[PDB]
């Protein structure tokens, strides 16, 4: 009865040369029962990806509040929104439900279309912004993934490198997570183009 | 007490009908003519802007075309504020539906509830209805390219093309003499800015007094594009049918 | 570990920079010095979320307030405004907050307790190493402390907490507010615990990782 | 309300349901339909806390059956599950949540293509090609994994029905008195008559 | 003319129209009557009918075992006004266990009134009230009027020609005041004191009403074959 | 015409209602005058006590809002306390929640806002009053605020208020041309009483006795009013000169 | 450690400066004396945060009183006191003392401890835990004391609790109340200790 | 007692006017001129201070006021309804925007929110239409410069340069002949000084104008440094001496 | 014009008509009268014994609020009922807060703000009364009169109703020939003769006398009805001086 552990999961998210990537793993579970092996926690509006781990029912809630609060963002702007307005909105959102809150851990991930500066965050299930330059972590195996994280990482990666090493750092962090794996994708993001790779992991 | 001072706003006259209903469509015949004409392959939304001044900027202006979402956007004729008020409640019904059913909204559905609004102002609460006229171009997976109109009252109807605001009695004759079923969106922007240029009460139609904008399928298989025209599109555009 | 300190014309208020969940290090370089207004400004142990929000309403309500007196914000209407806040909801909203400022009346040194007391003070620490840095000014704080001998004092506060408490670490973050002169934030204003060189490059050979699909993400219209 | 099993074959899906109900130590009924048709090509198939499941199923429909009428048009399956999501998640943050379980077996008449969702108490939607919900996953979907096949046809996915069945009357402690069967296809939804 | 629109408007000579067309209503009502004595208080009323088929209207309300009131005017708005007066009682007995004081009914009754001659959207009370009781301080009459005026009297008289009743009562006052420890010679000077009011029509078994209370007497109305003693 | 019944524009783009509540004002026939010195603000207002049954000392048109703001009405008693009270909860209120005694200038803002929302909100009447705020603010200094029932307010060097209004504001006018400054260039508010008591005498052309006048001074961190006999010794001062 | 007595020219408020958070002391130069009026104050126990919070209501209620009806009563001080504490005495934890001076009634003490209720004595003194002391040393207190007798009573009678303490500590702080205006005193722990 | 009037005081006339929003209008009419320039560079705005007596002082009436600091409003019409709406403004600029995106709204949306209470007046229950029009001028990342008026109807239009009140049709005129392109920021300062003489009547100084800019970034202005993304207020509003300064080379 | 028709609404004259009209309803009501003296307040009425049926003496008209202050008013009877009731919540409440009984001038304003309400909306009408009111409280002897308006004022003596300029008259006799001070005891004769006085201008009806009084040494600062042989020596007074 502990609700960010029910359904377990994974996002990682790292910065490179002109670059940022974010991962997940697939596995949708009941405590001990694999239920789904296709449940992705990555989601994009516009050029800015969203990760959440934690209760699955407020993955699926707070991505369609994302996409609702956007969208109306979008028309009344005239323009996409930017990842640091994106984090900012994530953490307003998530704070105004401070006594009943969202059983979530987002991480956001995207490049600003204006000044090209990689951009991640990461919050608590409250709203508060751990702005980083080197990676951000969330879910079930974070223990797993920050030290992995801690000792793989190195600044100023390319984008055919850093997919490399936020990949080991997910599959590694993922095999030693009974409630994480179950297959795995990343999102390699550039300025102008966005490449999504799944991953081969043990099915176990 | 306050009796005194009530206009009524909903009440029937002798003979039937809603005073401020009434009045409110009065106000909308003196707004700037917007055409709506629905083609095969797409729809053409065109509206006269009301005497446009020299020092007025154009490129940075919303006046009459307001997308409601990314497949249906509205045509205004009446009081701004008013319209922009609706507008809002409209894109927000919208994202409201998205978000219960995973689906964008179909046109009727959006159209009707924002039909609904204007209604209950005629019905009840004691307040003026609002000044507005729309025309509702749209598209869904069900009925394909669609017009409505909807206007203080309340009432919508479906539409081949269709006219409101300022000298529609003439407007909707000009379109019925030279609309038919098997008409390209290329041949309904022509017929559109035709129509403007003959019923406008401006001396020659230019592109600083237009807003203009299509909802085609343009883009690559099977999906909706909609374009907000520049003024720069529109000026090319009025030259190209041969009107400048 | 949050200090204040009072000096001759101003007071200073200093900062580390680690956040944690548990025992583990979420945050290496967060910031916990907050701008409630231009010349007050906020440090804050407990929550994270609750400091930093309960920061952001007072200090949106203080600019508001400031825009219809015409007058600069007092450093008490943001105690007496976080005070109220935090009373209302009886602890439920665990900001523990340092709060420091100049304005018209001169320069103010307060500390607020989650559930809604104030204290007055020269020194004052906040947070687990409070112990760790009160330590250190009650040792070596003085009346008629000059501005570099109280960023001093503070910053030697604050380290004693790195140093001695788990719960603090990383880098200092200072934050001067002289009367008749701009408050100067001093972000890292120290930075010693620098990550040392790694033995080996983790650099994977390209082609390491097994893939099985493909495809290119539209992002575009 | 313990056993709700879904299949989703190459041109239907399959919704088998316990006919068990049992309050204290004594079976009251053996012949309980745990289902409630949303629409002619949709069916709901539910199991939880007592009279909450009926409530909700039944609610869930009027619903369904109100936006049939308004719009004269059949909501898509994927439409209905997230609306049926919504209601749940919701009613996990009320003063006294539903705890419904459901399957939701739909053919799309768009799409041409049968569709299967799971969706828990809590708003936790999935689409699956086969699904359960309690204990019923534990002892079936290791066979499901194992004989299931993507382009199986309607007859084919009874018979992997019956192995589930015949695997769940083993090895489980409650006789949940066999199972009421009813598929869903382009021509709509029929049960079958004998299992 | 233009200030009698509602009952929140003051007229030029500072007259509230509204309460006074209310006060109209209550000459047309048919007439009751009521007197006192030191040991007992009597109400006499002329029932009216809508014609021979129908039944005659009841004037008199009892509020408690020890008070009651007769009606001249709006019977609805008596109805309203004698449930308040039962519930004033009933809650003195329930939470005081003390009767209610015929004067703190009287103040309640006038507080009631006056909140519907100050406020929009309202109307004043259509009906005038004689309330009878005995309590802690012997035998009392009460003559209210819509407009909030309440008044203690030994005797008066509401409704069409009360006029006649009155002078009578004023005449008698002297004589009926001192019928102490005698109920039915009380009446007879109330029946006495309503016929004079009476116009071509004269009092039958069913058109009169009497009620009585008093020091070993609970609130008691008589009609039919029992007011027959007193024709 | 309903338009001039309540607040609502007539065709010419006016408010008759807020116009005829400032005509409501000098209803009471009586001015008041307000300068400021060095250190201190003066308020003075004409006291009429034509009834001889009347307790003069209840006699009042001066209110001590907070304990350094004081407050002067042009208007009919019953809306002058109707502002004063609010104003008195206005100003304590403001202490509660912002921690420091509220300015004489944002009081005045806060009155002038209430005032305009009545000439927008129709159930809601103007009051027929004119609020002459003082006090010595900590921030400004010697502080004149003036609100009206139009929602009008603004700071004063000198003000005057009631039917010969403009007669006392040339007067002070004409002397501020003189000494080319923005204030009293006097120490003691004693003097500053002299002075603005001087001004009106001259202005009305009317003789004052003790009890023909109502003072109220602002200093620093308190305002109060003058008694009769505080007034008297003020009044042999100027006689003596 | 808190007490307030009266004497011949008015009446005086002690506390001791010491705040604590189990057995770690917050504040060692604490101001718990609080000014609700300029010749009433009061004396703070029990929760710091529940104290500030009524003392800043009492302030605001008495600077209104001020303003409509002229210079409050201790009385009326106190009783704006209890209200708060009676009402709110489900959610509060403050142990308070009020005195204040009226040229009409000198020097008045009233208590308002945990119940809420509302006592006026010739003084009071509250230790530890919100703890009012009914005799402490009666033959020891006199009617009509002298300024320095009374401020040497105190003085002698915190320094007694803070020597058994651990609660109280630090500074011992006095306010005099007396037609002459209001006094500040202060004594160090090398001056109080010595007794 | 209470708000009886829950009905609507605008309704249209049979010839489909809003009488009280017409008459609104009139109001701003009468009001005193003031008007806006958009430069390539910036935006001014511009009033004349219309004192109302000598004694009062006119530093305390501010009619040119700061919404947010890259966001500035001047208005033509009644001061009271203008200094409420300003409040508005502010107030709506944080509540709506700023506590959920965490930066300051755009001029278009901020103009968008203060037209929303404008028509608000025009339709709910026992209330009259502002009267006022607005001149808001305002800078942001994505929009750059831009200058907007705001009527008592609700509605609102983009400018290159425009004027409202008592000297507009003549103002406005005059502003045709001399706006371009091209236009720096101290060129549309002295033009808006030059569009001004024409309708102020008395004194013509620092004392009687009230002038303010939508320009670069203001760092001496923010009250800190430390934080380099944080560069100060694009609003400046002009001293007394710095228009005496431009009005000898005029 | 059509200013006069709806309450709060102001004429081109800056009057609120309709409060004007409230004063003719309470100068067509019987005469009432208040008289401060050294230690207290006298309030006195006239009551019209329109008929022989009229129970002498238990019609009372002056109302007590709290036990210190006396109340009596000339115009709509029930409106002043309506004015003491929310007088005794104002009372009631103040005493609960502040412990103290209510200052008179603090009661006043209570009152004062009570009634100028009811002249600020159209969905109201204002008061048709006007109530004279006092008592003593720790500054000394109070004596109070309000107005429809919600205007009201200290008085040395008080008078409103059908015979208030007679009243007046005599009232200022009083404080001219009394300088010094008038006694509590002598107050209560005076009021009996003044209301015989302002009689004659409502002589149709006869009368019955109403006086009650609030002193520091008589009545112990509590409000009393003078009764008994007090009040038939006051009355004896009164008819020794008509005649
Ligand atoms: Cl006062
Ligand atoms: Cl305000
Ligand atoms: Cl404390
Ligand atoms: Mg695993
Ligand atoms: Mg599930
Ligand atoms: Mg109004």
Not at chain 3, 6 to 19: E, L, M, P, Q
Not at chain 5, 50 to 59: C, G, T
Not at chain 6, 2 to 12: L, Q
Not at chain 7, 47 to 53: F, H, I
Request: charged share 25%; with cysteine.
């Amino acid at each position: 009865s502990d609700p960010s552990s029910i359904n377990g999961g994974i996002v990682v998210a790292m910065t490179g040369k002109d670059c940022v990537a974010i991962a997940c793993d697939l596995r949708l579970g009941s405590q001990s029962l694999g239920v789904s092996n296709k449940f992705e926690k990555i989601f994009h509006y516009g050029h800015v990806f969203l990760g959440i781990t934690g209760l699955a029912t407020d993955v699926t809630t707070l991505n369609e509040m994302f996409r609702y609060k956007t969208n109306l963002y979008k028309l009344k702007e005239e323009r996409a929104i930017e990842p640091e307005t994106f984090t900012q909105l994530v953490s307003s959102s998530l704070y105004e439900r401070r006594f009943g809150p969202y059983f979530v851990g987002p991480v956001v991930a995207g490049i600003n279309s204006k000044s090209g500066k990689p951009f991640i965050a990461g919050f608590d299930l409250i709203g508060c912004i751990d702005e980083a330059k080197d990676f951000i972590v969330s879910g079930t195996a974070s223990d797993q993934l920050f030290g992995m994280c801690e000792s793989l990482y190195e600044p100023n990666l390319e984008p055919e490198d850093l997919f490399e090493t936020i990949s080991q750092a997910l599959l590694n962090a993922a095999d030693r997570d009974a409630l994480s794996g179950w297959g795995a994708v990343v999102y390699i993001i550039k300025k102008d183009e966005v490449v999504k790779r799944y991953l081969k992991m043990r099915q176990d | 007490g306050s009796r005194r001072y009530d206009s009524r706003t909903t009440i029937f006259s002798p003979e039937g009908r809603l005073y401020q209903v009434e009045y409110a469509l009065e106000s909308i015949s003196h707004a700037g003519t917007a055409i709506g004409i629905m083609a095969s392959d797409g729809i053409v939304l065109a509206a006269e802007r009301k005497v446009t001044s020299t020092l007025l900027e154009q490129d940075t202006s919303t006046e009459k075309l307001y997308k409601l979402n990314d497949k249906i956007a509205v045509a205004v004729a009446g009081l701004t504020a008013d319209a922009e008020i609706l507008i809002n409640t409209a894109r927000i019904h919208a994202q409201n539906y998205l978000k219960t059913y995973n689906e964008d909204i179909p046109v009727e559905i959006l159209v009707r509830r924002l039909s609904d609004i204007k209604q209950g102002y005629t019905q009840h609460g004691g307040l003026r209805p609002f000044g507005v006229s729309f025309i509702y171009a749209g598209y869904d997976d069900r009925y394909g390219y669609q017009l409505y109109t909807s206007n203080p009252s309340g009432n919508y109807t479906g539409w081949k093309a269709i006219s409101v605001g300022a000298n529609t009695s003439a407007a909707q004759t000009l379109l019925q003499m030279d609309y038919k079923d098997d008409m390209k969106v290329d041949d309904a922007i022509e017929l559109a800015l035709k129509t403007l240029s003959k019923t406008t009460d401006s001396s020659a139609l230019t592109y600083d007094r237009l807003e203009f904008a299509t909802i085609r399928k343009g883009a690559n298989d099977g999906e909706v594009y909609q374009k907000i025209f520049k003024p720069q599109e529109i000026k090319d555009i009025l030259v190209k049918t041969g009107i400048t | 570990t949050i200090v204040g300190v009072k000096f001759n014309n101003g007071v200073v208020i200093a900062a580390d920079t680690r956040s944690t969940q548990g025992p583990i290090v979420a945050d290496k370089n967060c910031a916990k010095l907050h701008r409630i207004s231009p010349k007050i400004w906020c440090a804050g142990a407990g929550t994270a979320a609750d400091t930093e929000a309960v920061t952001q309403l007072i200090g949106s309500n203080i600019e508001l307030h400031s825009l219809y007196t015409s007058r600069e914000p007092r450093v008490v209407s943001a105690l007496q405004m976080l005070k109220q806040h935090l009373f209302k909801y009886q602890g439920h909203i665990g900001a523990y907050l340092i709060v420091a400022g100049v304005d018209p009346t001169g320069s103010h040194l307060f500390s607020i307790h989650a559930h809604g007391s104030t204290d007055v003070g020269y020194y004052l620490s906040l947070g687990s190493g409070s112990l760790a840095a009160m330590a250190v000014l009650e040792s070596h704080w003085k009346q008629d402390l000059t501005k570099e001998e109280a960023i001093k004092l503070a910053s030697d506060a604050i380290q004693a907490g790195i140093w001695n408490d788990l719960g603090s670490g990383s880098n200092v973050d200072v934050c001067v507010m002289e009367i008749g002169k701009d408050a100067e934030y001093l972000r890292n204003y120290l930075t010693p615990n620098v990550r040392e060189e790694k033995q080996k490059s983790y650099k994977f050979p390209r082609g390491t990782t097994a893939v099985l699909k493909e495809s290119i993400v539209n992002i575009c219209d | 309300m313990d056993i709700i099993l879904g299949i989703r074959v190459q041109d239907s899906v399959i919704l088998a349901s316990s006919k068990a109900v049992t309050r204290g130590i004594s079976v009251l009924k053996d012949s309980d339909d745990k289902t409630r048709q949303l629409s002619p090509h949709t069916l709901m198939s539910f199991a939880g806390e007592a009279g909450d499941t009926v409530q909700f199923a039944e609610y869930i429909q009027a619903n369904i059956q109100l936006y049939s009428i308004r719009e004269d048009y059949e909501l898509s399956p994927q439409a209905v599950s997230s609306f049926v999501r919504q209601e749940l998640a919701k009613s996990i943050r009320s003063r006294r949540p539903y705890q419904v379980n459901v399957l939701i077996g739909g053919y799309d008449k768009k799409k041409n293509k049968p569709e299967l969702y799971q969706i828990d108490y809590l708003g936790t939607k999935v689409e699956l090609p086969y699904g359960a919900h309690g204990y019923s996953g534990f002892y079936t979907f290791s066979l499901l994994d194992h004989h299931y096949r993507p382009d199986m046809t309607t007859e084919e996915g009874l018979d992997l029905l019956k192995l589930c069945v015949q695997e769940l009357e083993k090895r489980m402690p409650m006789d949940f008195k066999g199972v009421i069967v009813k598929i869903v296809d382009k021509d709509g939804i029929r049960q079958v008559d004998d299992f | 003319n233009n200030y009698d629109g509602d009952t929140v408007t003051f007229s030029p000579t500072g007259r509230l129209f509204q309460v006074e067309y209310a006060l109209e209503a209550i000459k047309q009502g048919s007439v009751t009557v009521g007197l006192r004595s030191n040991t007992h208080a009597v109400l006499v009323a002329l029932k009216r009918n809508a014609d021979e088929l129908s039944s005659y209207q009841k004037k008199i309300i009892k509020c408690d075992e020890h008070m009651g009131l007769s009606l001249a005017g709006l019977a609805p708005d008596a109805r309203v006004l004698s449930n308040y007066l039962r519930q004033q009682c009933n809650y003195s007995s329930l939470v005081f266990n003390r009767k209610l004081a015929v004067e703190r009914a009287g103040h309640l009754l006038c507080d009631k009134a006056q909140k519907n001659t100050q406020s929009y959207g309202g109307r004043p009370y259509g009906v005038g009230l004689l309330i009878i009781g005995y309590d802690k301080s012997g035998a009392h009459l009460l003559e209210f009027q819509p407009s909030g005026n309440v008044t203690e009297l030994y005797g008066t008289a509401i409704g069409a020609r009360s006029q006649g009743a009155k002078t009578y009562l004023e005449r008698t006052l002297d004589t009926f005041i001192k019928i102490d420890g005698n109920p039915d010679e009380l009446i007879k000077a109330g029946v006495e004191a309503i016929s004079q009011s009476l116009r071509d029509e004269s009092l039958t078994v069913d058109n009169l009403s009497i009620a009585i209370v008093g020091k070993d007497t609970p609130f008691t109305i008589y009609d039919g074959e029992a007011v027959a003693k007193y024709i | 015409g309903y338009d001039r019944h309540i607040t609502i524009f007539s065709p010419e783009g006016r408010l008759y209602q807020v116009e005829y509540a400032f005509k409501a004002t000098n209803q009471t026939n009586i001015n008041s005058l307000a300068v400021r010195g060095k250190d201190c603000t003066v308020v003075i207002s004409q006291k009429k006590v034509p009834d001889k049954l009347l307790d003069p000392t209840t006699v009042s048109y001066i209110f001590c809002i907070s304990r350094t703001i004081g407050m002067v009405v042009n208007g009919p008693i019953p809306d002058a306390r109707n502002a004063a009270l609010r104003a008195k909860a206005e100003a304590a209120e403001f202490r509660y929640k912002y921690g420091y005694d509220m300015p004489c200038d944002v009081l005045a803002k806060r009155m002038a806002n209430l005032s305009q929302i009545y000439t927008q909100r129709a159930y809601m009447r103007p009051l027929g009053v004119i609020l002459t705020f003082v006090s010595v603010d900590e921030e400004l200094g010697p502080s004149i605020y003036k609100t009206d029932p139009a929602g009008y307010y603004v700071g004063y060097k000198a003000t005057a208020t009631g039917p010969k209004q403009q007669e006392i504001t040339t007067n002070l006018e004409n002397h501020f041309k003189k000494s080319k400054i923005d204030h009293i260039n006097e120490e003691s508010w004693e003097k500053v009483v002299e002075f603005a008591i001087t001004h009106m005498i001259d202005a009305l052309g009317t003789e004052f006795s003790k009890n023909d006048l109502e003072v109220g001074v602002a200093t620093k961190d308190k305002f109060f009013t003058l008694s009769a006999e505080n007034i008297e010794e003020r009044l042999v001062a100027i006689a003596e000169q | 450690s808190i007490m307030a007595v009266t004497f011949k020219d008015g009446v005086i408020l002690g506390a001791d400066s010491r705040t604590t958070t189990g057995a770690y002391i917050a504040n060692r130069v604490t101001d718990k004396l609080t000014r609700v009026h300029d010749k009433i104050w009061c004396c703070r126990s029990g929760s710091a945060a529940d104290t500030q919070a009524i003392a800043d209501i009492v302030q605001y209620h008495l600077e209104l009183y001020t303003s409509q009806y002229g210079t409050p009563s201790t009385e009326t001080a106190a009783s704006v006191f209890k209200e708060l504490c009676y009402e709110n005495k489900d959610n509060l934890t403050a142990g308070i003392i009020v005195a204040g001076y009226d040229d009409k009634n000198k020097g008045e003490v009233y208590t308002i401890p945990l119940g809420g209720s509302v006592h006026k004595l010739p003084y009071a003194i509250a230790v530890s835990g919100s703890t009012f002391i009914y005799g402490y040393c009666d033959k020891n207190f006199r009617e009509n004391m002298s300024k320095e007798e009374t401020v040497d009573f105190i003085k002698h009678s915190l320094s007694q609790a803070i020597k058994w303490d651990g609660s109280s500590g630090g500074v011992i702080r006095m306010v005099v109340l007396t037609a002459a205006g209001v006094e500040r005193l202060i004594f160090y722990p090398d001056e109080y200790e010595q007794l | 007692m209470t708000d009886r009037y829950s009905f609507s005081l605008t309704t249209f006339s049979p010839s489909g006017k809003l009488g009280q929003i017409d008459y609104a209008l009139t109001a701003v009419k009468q009001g005193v001129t003031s008007l806006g320039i958009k430069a390539t560079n910036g935006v001014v705005i511009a009033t004349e201070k219309k004192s109302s007596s000598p004694l009062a002082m006119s530093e305390t009436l501010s009619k040119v006021s700061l919404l947010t600091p890259d966001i500035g409003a001047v208005y033509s019409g009644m001061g009271p309804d203008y200094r409420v709406l300003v409040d508005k403004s502010r107030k709506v600029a944080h509540t709506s925007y700023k506590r959920i995106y965490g930066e300051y709204p755009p001029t278009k949306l901020l103009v968008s929110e203060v037209a929303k209470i404008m028509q608000e007046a025009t339709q709910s229950g026992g209330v009259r239409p502002f009267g006022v029009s607005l001149l808001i001028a305002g800078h942001d990342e994505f929009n750059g410069f831009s200058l907007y008026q705001v009527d008592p109807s609700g509605s609102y239009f983009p400018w290159k340069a425009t004027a409202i009140g008592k000297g507009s049709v003549a103002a406005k005129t005059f502003l045709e002949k001399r706006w371009n392109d091209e236009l720096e920021l101290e060129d549309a300062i002295h033009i808006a000084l030059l569009t001004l003489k024409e309708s102020v009547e008395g004194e013509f100084n620092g004392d009687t104008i009230e002038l303010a800019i939508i320009g670069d970034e203001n760092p001496d202005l923010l009250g800190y440094t430390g934080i380099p993304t944080d560069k100060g207020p694009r609003f400046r509003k002009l001293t007394s001496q710095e228009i005496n300064d431009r009005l000898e080379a005029l | 014009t059509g200013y006069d028709l709806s309450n709060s609404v102001f004429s081109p004259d800056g009057r609120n008509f309709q409060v004007e009209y409230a004063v003719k309803a309470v100068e067509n009501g019987t005469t009432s009268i208040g008289i401060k003296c050294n230690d207290g307040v006298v309030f006195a009425v006239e009551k019209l014994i329109t008929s022989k049926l009229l129970v002498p003496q238990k019609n009372v008209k002056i109302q007590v609020v709290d036990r210190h202050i006396g109340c009596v008013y000339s115009g709509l009877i029930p409106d002043g009922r309506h004015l003491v009731n929310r007088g005794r919540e104002e009372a009631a409440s103040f005493k609960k807060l502040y412990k103290t009984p209510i200052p008179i001038p603090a009661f006043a304003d209570r009152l004062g703000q009570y009634v100028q309400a009811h002249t600020l909306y159209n969905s109201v009408r204002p008061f048709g009364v006007s109530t004279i009111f006092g008592g003593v409280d720790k500054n000394g002897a109070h004596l109070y009169m309000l107005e429809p308006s919600g205007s009201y004022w200290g008085y040395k003596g008080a008078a409103t109703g059908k015979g208030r300029q007679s009243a007046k008259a005599e009232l200022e006799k009083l404080v001219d020939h009394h300088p010094e001070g008038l006694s509590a005891r002598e107050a209560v004769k005076q009021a009996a003769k003044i209301i015989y006085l302002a009689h004659e201008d409502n002589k149709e009806k006869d009368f019955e006398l109403e006086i009650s009084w609030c002193s520091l040494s008589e009545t112990n600062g509590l409000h009393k009805f003078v009764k008994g042989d007090l009040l038939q020596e006051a009355i004896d007074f009164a008819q020794k001086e008509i005649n």
